[PDB]
């Protein structure tokens, strides 16, 4: 019944200090190694550092270039500070307990993990998207879509026809533009016969700006 969970800001500006807290519930901070671990996108899981017990010995990974501090500030919390962040520090951050005792499952492993928190290092400000229709020039199958451009932070979700259209939908991972804003596409393929038996609307939701847009997409015609 020992559970861990990470908390703290999901956005840190470059050069600033990333701070996170792990709250242990059920149990408390006791005689284990209390660890931080991270996974940057596209990279392996990486150990950051640990502390033993309440104010016991620490150990930090040399890969973090001496930017780490870990402390146990309450009976149920331990914290991470990671100084002087850059985009290389964007990652999902996990707290985890390293099991020390040979009489339990998980000996010498991370047996208990938090769910993880995404921390992104960025100078960008919250902005809702613009939504543009995707229609190709006029084989039996048509493609239509929506381009959801210029928003921050992630995520944006897209449905079609208020959730009634799910077959053939592909909503892609966003890409980060050099402006610091994301762009994403959502497409659907449909029978070309349906291009006159059905209206197509993409429903875009950007919760961080509370922006919803319902965009009707019409096919091109040479008539």
């Amino acid at each position: 019944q020992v559970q861990l969970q990470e908390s703290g800001p999901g956005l840190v500006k470059p050069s600033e200090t990333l701070s996170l807290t792990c709250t242990v519930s059920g149990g408390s901070i006791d005689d284990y190694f209390w660890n931080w671990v991270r996974q940057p996108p596209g990279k392996p899981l990486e150990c950051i550092g640990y502390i033993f017990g309440r104010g016991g010995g620490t150990k930090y990974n040399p890969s973090l270039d001496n930017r780490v501090t870990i402390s146990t500030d309450t009976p149920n919390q331990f914290s991470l500070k990671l100084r002087s962040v850059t985009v290389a520090d964007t990652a999902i951050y996990y707290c985890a307990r390293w099991n020390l005792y040979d009489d339990d499952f998980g000996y010498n492993s991370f047996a208990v993990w938090g769910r993880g928190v995404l921390v992104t290092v960025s100078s960008a400000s919250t902005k809702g998207p613009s939504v543009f229709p995707l229609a190709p020039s006029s084989g039996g199958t048509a493609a239509l879509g929506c381009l959801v451009k210029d928003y921050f932070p992630e995520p944006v979700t897209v449905s079609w026809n208020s959730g009634a259209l799910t077959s053939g939908v592909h909503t892609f991972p966003a890409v980060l533009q050099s402006s610091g804003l994301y762009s994403l596409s959502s497409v659907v393929t449909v029978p070309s016969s349906s291009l006159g038996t059905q209206t197509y609307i993409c429903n875009v939701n950007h919760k961080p700006s509370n922006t919803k847009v319902d965009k009707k997409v019409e096919p091109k015609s040479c008539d």
Binding site: P44, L45, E46, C47, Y50, K59, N61, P62, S63, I92, Y94, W98, N99, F105, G106, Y107, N108, S109, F110, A111, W113, G114, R115, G116, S130, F132, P133, L134, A135, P136, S137, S138, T141, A143, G145, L147, K149, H170, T171, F172, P173, A174, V175, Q177, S183, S185, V187, T189, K220, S221, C222
Partner: protein, 214 residues
């Protein structure tokens, strides 16, 4: 630190298959070797500790073996919930280094992409930017390449792309690529082309349009 290398980085299998994932340590670590499972949107959970011991609740179809520098995770009778990423980790010396992960994907039949090209919308052009989009739809395997040209000029550095996760039923992938150009530049050129290379095609295919065409 102790370098950990898994083989392969990704593999394809079918439900019911036996899958074997390899993990190598650059220095020997005894039996101090863990395996974890992860999914999209789900963090790691422990599968195996001490090389061969199953964590509580882990199905017996998961088997860890090996020692020293050479280890294996065997998944017998692969189930739908087992398509996931598996990582090994040495627990001998801190930092307890992880392998790069092995993604277990679904096997599928080779399928060439269906390719569609979308001009910038009139709505977008009202502003100063134009995005041209090329869709590679429902293809297998995942490797594919897009080349963009504008009036025969190779576009290099002004596109971005992304790929969906595998489709649950058909095993396929899709890819979207966006070419970004200014509105002034889009309006100064005529021919827009997306050339696609993929195993399922005997040679490249090109989809194109002339600006303004219906």
């Amino acid at each position: 630190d102790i370098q950990m290398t898994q083989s392969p980085s990704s593999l394809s299998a079918s439900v019911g298959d036996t899958v074997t994932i390899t993990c190598q340590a650059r220095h020997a670590v005894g039996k101090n070797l863990n395996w974890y499972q992860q999914k999209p949107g789900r963090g790691p959970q422990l599968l195996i500790y001490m090389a061969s011991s199953r964590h509580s609740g882990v199905p017996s179809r998961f088997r860890g073996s090996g020692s020293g520098r050479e280890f294996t995770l065997t998944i017998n009778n692969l189930q739908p919930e087992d398509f996931a990423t598996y990582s090994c980790q040495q627990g001998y010396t801190y930092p307890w280094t992880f392998g790069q992960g092995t993604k277990v994907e679904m096997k599928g039949a080779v399928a060439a992409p269906s390719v569609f090209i979308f001009p910038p919308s009139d709505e977008q052009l009202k502003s100063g930017t134009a995005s041209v989009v090329c869709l590679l739809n429902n293809f297998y395997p995942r490797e594919a390449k897009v080349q963009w040209k504008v009036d025969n000029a190779l576009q290099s550095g002004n596109s971005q792309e992304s790929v969906t996760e595998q489709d649950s039923k058909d095993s396929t992938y899709s890819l979207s690529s966006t070419l970004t150009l200014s509105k002034a530049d889009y309006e100064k050129h005529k021919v827009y082309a997306c050339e696609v290379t993929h195993q399922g095609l005997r040679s490249p295919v090109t989809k194109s349009f002339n600006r303004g065409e219906c």
